[PDB]
Amino acid sequence: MKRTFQPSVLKRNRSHGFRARMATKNGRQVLARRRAKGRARLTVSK
Amino acid sequence: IFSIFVI
Amino acid sequence: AVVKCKPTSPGRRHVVKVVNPELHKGKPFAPLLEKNSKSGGRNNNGRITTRHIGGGHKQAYRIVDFKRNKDGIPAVVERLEYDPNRSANIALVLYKDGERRYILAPKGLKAGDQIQSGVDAAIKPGNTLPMRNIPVGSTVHNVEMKPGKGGQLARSAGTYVQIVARDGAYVTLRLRSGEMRKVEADCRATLGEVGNAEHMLRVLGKAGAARWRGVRPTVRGTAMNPVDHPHGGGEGRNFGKHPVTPWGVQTKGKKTRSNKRTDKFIVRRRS
RNA sequence: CUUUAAUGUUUGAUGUUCUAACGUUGACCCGUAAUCCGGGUUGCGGACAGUGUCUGGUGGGUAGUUUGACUGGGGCGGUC
RNA sequence: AAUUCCUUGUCGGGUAAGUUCCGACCUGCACGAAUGGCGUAAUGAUGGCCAGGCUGUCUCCACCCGAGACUCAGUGAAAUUGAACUCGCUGUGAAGAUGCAGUGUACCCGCGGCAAGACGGAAAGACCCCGUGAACCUUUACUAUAGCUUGACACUGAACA
RNA sequence: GCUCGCCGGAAGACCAAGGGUUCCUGUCCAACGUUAAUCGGGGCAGGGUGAGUCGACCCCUAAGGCGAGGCCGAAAGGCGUAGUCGAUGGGAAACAGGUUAAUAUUCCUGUACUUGGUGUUACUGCGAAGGGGGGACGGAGAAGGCUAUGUUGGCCGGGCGACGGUUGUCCCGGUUUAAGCGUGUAGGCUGGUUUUCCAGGCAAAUCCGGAAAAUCAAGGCUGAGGCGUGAUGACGAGGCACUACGGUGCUGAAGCAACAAAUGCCCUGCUUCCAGGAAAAGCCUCUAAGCAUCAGGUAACAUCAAAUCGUACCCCAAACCGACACAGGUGGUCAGGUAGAGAAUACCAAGGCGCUUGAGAGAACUCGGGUGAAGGAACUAGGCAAAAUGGUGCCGUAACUUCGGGAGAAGGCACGCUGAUAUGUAGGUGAGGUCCCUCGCGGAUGGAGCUGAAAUCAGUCGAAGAUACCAGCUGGCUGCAACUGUUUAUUAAAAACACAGCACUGUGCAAACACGAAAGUGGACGUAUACGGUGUGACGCCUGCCCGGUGCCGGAAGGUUAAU
RNA sequence: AGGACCGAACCGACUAAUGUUGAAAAAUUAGCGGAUGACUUGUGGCUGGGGGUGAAAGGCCAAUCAAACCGGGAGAUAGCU
Numbered sequence A: 001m002k003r004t005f006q007p008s009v010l011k012r013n014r015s016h017g018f019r020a021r022m023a024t025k026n027g028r029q030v031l032a033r034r035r036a037k038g039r040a041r042l043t044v045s046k
Numbered sequence B: 001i002f003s004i005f006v007i
Numbered sequence C: 001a002v003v004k005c006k007p008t009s010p011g012r013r014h015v016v017k018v019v020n021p022e023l024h025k026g027k028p029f030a031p032l033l034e035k036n037s038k039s040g041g042r043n044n045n046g047r048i049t050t051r052h053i054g055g056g057h058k059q060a061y062r063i064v065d066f067k068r069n070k071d072g073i074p075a076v077v078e079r080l081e082y083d084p085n086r087s088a089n090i091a092l093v094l095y096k097d098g099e100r101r102y103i104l105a106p107k108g109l110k111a112g113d114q115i116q117s118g119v120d121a122a123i124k125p126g127n128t129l130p131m132r133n134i135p136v137g138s139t140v141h142n143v144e145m146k147p148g149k150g151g152q153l154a155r156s157a158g159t160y161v162q163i164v165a166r167d168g169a170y171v172t173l174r175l176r177s178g179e180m181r182k183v184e185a186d187c188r189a190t191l192g193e194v195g196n197a198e199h200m201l202r203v204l205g206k207a208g209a210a211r212w213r214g215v216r217p218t219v220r221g222t223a224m225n226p227v228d229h230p231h232g233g234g235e236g237r238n239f240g241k242h243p244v245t246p247w248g249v250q251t252k253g254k255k256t257r258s259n260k261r262t263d264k265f266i267v268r269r270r271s
Numbered sequence D: 001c002u003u004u005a006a007u008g009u010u011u012g013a014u015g016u017u018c019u020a021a022c023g024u025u026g027a028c029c030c031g032u033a034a035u036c037c038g039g040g041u042u043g044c045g046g047a048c049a050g051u052g053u054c055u056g057g058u059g060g061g062u063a064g065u066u067u068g069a070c071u072g073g074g075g076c077g078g079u080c
Numbered sequence E: 001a002a003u004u005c006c007u008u009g010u011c012g013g014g015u016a017a018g019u020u021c022c023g024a025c026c027u028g029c030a031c032g033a034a035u036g037g038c039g040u041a042a043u044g045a046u047g048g049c050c051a052g053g054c055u056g057u058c059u060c061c062a063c064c065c066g067a068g069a070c071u072c073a074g075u076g077a078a079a080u081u082g083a084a085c086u087c088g089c090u091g092u093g094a095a096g097a098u099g100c101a102g103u104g105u106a107c108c109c110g111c112g113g114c115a116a117g118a119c120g121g122a123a124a125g126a127c128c129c130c131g132u133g134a135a136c137c138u139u140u141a142c143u144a145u146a147g148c149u150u151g152a153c154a155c156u157g158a159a160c161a
Numbered sequence F: 001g002c003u004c005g006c007c008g009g010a011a012g013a014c015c016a017a018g019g020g021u022u023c024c025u026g027u028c029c030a031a032c033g034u035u036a037a038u039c040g041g042g043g044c045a046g047g048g049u050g051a052g053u054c055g056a057c058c059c060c061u062a063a064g065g066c067g068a069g070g071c072c073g074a075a076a077g078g079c080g081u082a083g084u085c086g087a088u089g090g091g092a093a094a095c096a097g098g099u100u101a102a103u104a105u106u107c108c109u110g111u112a113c114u115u116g117g118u119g120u121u122a123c124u125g126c127g128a129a130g131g132g133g134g135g136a137c138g139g140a141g142a143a144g145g146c147u148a149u150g151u152u153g154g155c156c157g158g159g160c161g162a163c164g165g166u167u168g169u170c171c172c173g174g175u176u177u178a179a180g181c182g183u184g185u186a187g188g189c190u191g192g193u194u195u196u197c198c199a200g201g202c203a204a205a206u207c208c209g210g211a212a213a214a215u216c217a218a219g220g221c222u223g224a225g226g227c228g229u230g231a232u233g234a235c236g237a238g239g240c241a242c243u244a245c246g247g248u249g250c251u252g253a254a255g256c257a258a259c260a261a262a263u264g265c266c267c268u269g270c271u272u273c274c275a276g277g278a279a280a281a282g283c284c285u286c287u288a289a290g291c292a293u294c295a296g297g298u299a300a301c302a303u304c305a306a307a308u309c310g311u312a313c314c315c316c317a318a319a320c321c322g323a324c325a326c327a328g329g330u331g332g333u334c335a336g337g338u339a340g341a342g343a344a345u346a347c348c349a350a351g352g353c354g355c356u357u358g359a360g361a362g363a364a365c366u367c368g369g370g371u372g373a374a375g376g377a378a379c380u381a382g383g384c385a386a387a388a389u390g391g392u393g394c395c396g397u398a399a400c401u402u403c404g405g406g407a408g409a410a411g412g413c414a415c416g417c418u419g420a421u422a423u424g425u426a427g428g429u430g431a432g433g434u435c436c437c438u439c440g441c442g443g444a445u446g447g448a449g450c451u452g453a454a455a456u457c458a459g460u461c462g463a464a465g466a467u468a469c470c471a472g473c474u475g476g477c478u479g480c481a482a483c484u485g486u487u488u489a490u491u492a493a494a495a496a497c498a499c500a501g502c503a504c505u506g507u508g509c510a511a512a513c514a515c516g517a518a519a520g521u522g523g524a525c526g527u528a529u530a531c532g533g534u535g536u537g538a539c540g541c542c543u544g545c546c547c548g549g550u551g552c553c554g555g556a557a558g559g560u561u562a563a564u
Numbered sequence G: 001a002g003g004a005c006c007g008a009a010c011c012g013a014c015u016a017a018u019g020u021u022g023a024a025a026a027a028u029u030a031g032c033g034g035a036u037g038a039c040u041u042g043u044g045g046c047u048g049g050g051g052g053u054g055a056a057a058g059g060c061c062a063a064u065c066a067a068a069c070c071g072g073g074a075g076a077u078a079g080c081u
């Protein structure tokens, strides 16, 4: 049957990508936390 | 147990 | 011409269409169209804010001159058109200066008749005029409320307004609602009743007829649980509440008009 | 140095009139090739409307809670 | 009767025989007129009842063809499990015993079969109650409150009566 | 390699999405593969993605997003103008063939085209972020014209048959060919041309729009396909070579006609209907400021530019979503023969597969199928399941009915094959020949050739001719719900929800009402024949009494009553 | 002409058996409903947690729903085991 993950990069980037993340005070805090955590992929982009 | 049983 | 349908299927059995033969078959006057694009009853917040709205056919917007400024110049009504955006029909017009416009379509309409606006202008169906200059008792349709503003009263199929008096700088009108409202007299007001009238008599006949006019189903209060709506739960029908809107204010008689800014203008409310 | 009453006031209640705060989701003008905003002229409305503080009413629309114990299971009854 | 407790009410019909069904009666425990009454052609993977056809549904099961089950070769799981040298009966016993008493029976060990028992496995019961437990829902429970509404003062002025 | 079997509206073929080297070649078999494994989508190494024309980038915008200023908000922020982004839609242009182990409309051969720059030569009013035109649009239906495509004959090449026959009215195979350029057809739409004038198109306009006349009517767009050319080209049955036995070279016949024929194209057409059917740019035209020898504009020829990024492979799946090499889910494209109404179904072609444990046994039981004496629902909660019905034509068909229905009610009869009517008919198609002519892809007449149902009569085989596959069971009484529809993704599809119809009630527009501290937005670019809310639920006949309670509407008196 | 009829694709999910450490955390097989419409479908957009959406089942809001998930208050409190 049709399951929950129906991949699509356009939507991926638009919803979770760097710039999207960057477009909101909290989206930025998202990055900030991940940087402080020393994460190797801030936001799974190209 | 349920609840199905008886009762 | 109102016409029953033969029951070659349930949900035609009951249908009753209005067929207007003298209505322009074919495409409308292109340069008086702009896209309309549907609302889905939704806010600029994305929040359904008027329920029961969705789908329906596509609908391009006809412009329609409500103000009626082209005073002096006369025009001729080329043809009568169907408008999806309203109950009434519209008449493509053509003033002598070569300009085309969209008027409503008073009961007389009929291609070839001659229209004109302004303080001069024949008292005759279709001609717009300050009520300053329309004889008390006329049956004047699409009426302005603020002089020069637009025309906002009696625009629906078959509607009309009756000028009953005019002391001072003011006129008192008899709105179809039966209200008695004063209006500034300097207000434009096109002459006669508006068309279709028969519009009233269609019967639609099936579910789809509603859906494809962009109306979505209405789900009764008491068909839902307590959390959804003040009505019902009950283990079997049940009610036992004074009826209310899904936000708790009573329907069935509670007036809900509160203005004051505009009470000066209402002479006598309807019943 | 007045009640049976009335001219000058400082002051409430009501009714008319005015424009000058205030409204304008009328019209026109400019910023400006701009259905936002602002400025301007003007018509309409006009000390109303609206708003702030205070205040009586209404208020399951929304929230937090309470709704006893005994008991030959518990409830109902009875008891305290 | 989607409403009738008493109830398989009573009468009529259908059956050899009918607590259902069809038609009636009215004694409606406890129908009733837009939380609509009574009807209704057509429609319905809708509920109840009947008949023809049909038959392995049944009397009552037989044979056959294929896929497993069985044997060999290769690969190779699972839940459960205090420890096991893990029989029957009658009785005792935290009250339904493989394990206590008494007694009967039984050479040691597989493989294929079957599920009567291990109060078999699986989920720290939902029913039951209990906790000065939780949550959502209700209202003429209590206390508040957004909203709606009332007046006063401010923004707020001038006249004449 | 030879048989055998399975899919063939797929289990074949091309992609998008998604994956991201899974592609190809060597090499290895530990781990991965539900077994072995010499094999692999597995390890290691090397190779492989070639574009002015396909696509992205790009121009253009829809929904919607962002948003200088701005309005609003304790802060964070919210909304929105000018704009600026955003394809799921619009926008210039390449085709047939060949070649790589692996890409190719990208490389090669043949043959083309698009738009700009520059130059030459002619000829000319050029010119906007502006006006107008166009682009530009729905559903259903109806045929006609036509292609793909098929069938047969002719043509070409090959065959003379492992077993009676096959020199023939016999067998097998092939018979394919593009863009481009020329032609402008079936057929669609539309009266042209000139002069003058004008409150419109924010300014301007010669354009569009409007008003007059004036004169010929045949002018103009649009346009499948065919035909010519492209093409002495290519492809090509089949041949001969060699091959390291996978393949690889070379050579090369005919290449016509008739009939049938789409759901494709003509057709963004035509007819009709109501529910009334994006936007913007490219393109065309118009002028303003502006330039007037200039610059620009138009044409012919010549030449130069067209970057960058994608291009392997899987793509109804072992490569994507499902933790798996998982009986599931996954949008678009193509579509042959025989029978058939058919994209159903059965058997095949092209092509692709036999599903990554097998080998034997022929027990109980379980799963899935086949047949069954006599009986025929006795089974059971219940005919659950099985069984039966099943096509086409004609005959024929009850209550009731909203006059449509009920109806495929029910129930009958025929059905194959052969001959004849008729060496092949009714019909369809249609070349010659003759006349006509604005000579054409015209028209009229013309009937060869081709194609070819159904009927009847006569005869004939089987137990059986709708012979397989495929393919309604029917009727009677009754509750409920009018009906099509919707629902508890994953124990409830119903009598529940919805529905059209009905009623009450609110709402005069800065509407009621809803989201929102607010700005604002929806309601609606609507306006009482409208909109919200509530109940009821097609239709038919109808809907009685009670306002004491609770609520709502009205009520300028009086009693009680807040801040002050 | 039709929320018209029979019936594939496509969309549904009425019955049964199988399966229940599945082939599958809802399917398979045989039957079944709709199939020009309130139809069905690809791409992209908007709606946010006492909030959304809901032809209404307390349905759905990523295998989670009478108040989603992640982190925090946090070692909530637990007269109970």
Ligand SMILES: CC[C@H]1OC(=O)[C@H](C)[C@@H](O[C@H]2C[C@@](C)(OC)[C@@H](O)[C@H](C)O2)[C@H](C)[C@@H](O[C@@H]2O[C@H](C)C[C@H](N(C)C)[C@H]2O)[C@](C)(O)C[C@@H](C)C(=O)[C@H](C)[C@@H](O)[C@]1(C)O
Binding pocket: B001, B002, B003, B004, B005, E122, E123, G020
């Ligand atoms: C398919 C697969 C599932 O099986 C079924 O669902 C069967 C059909 C249920 O019966 C179904 C059907 C039925 C009839 O039970 C037989 C019904 O009464 C119950 C409630 O659910 C069972 C057995 C239920 O047990 C029963 O639950 C009762 C509370 C008590 C009973 N016990 C006293 C013996 C107990 O065995 C229960 C809870 O699901 C078992 C727990 C452990 C599980 O959740 C496990 C994971 C099951 O879901 C399952 C095995 O995976």
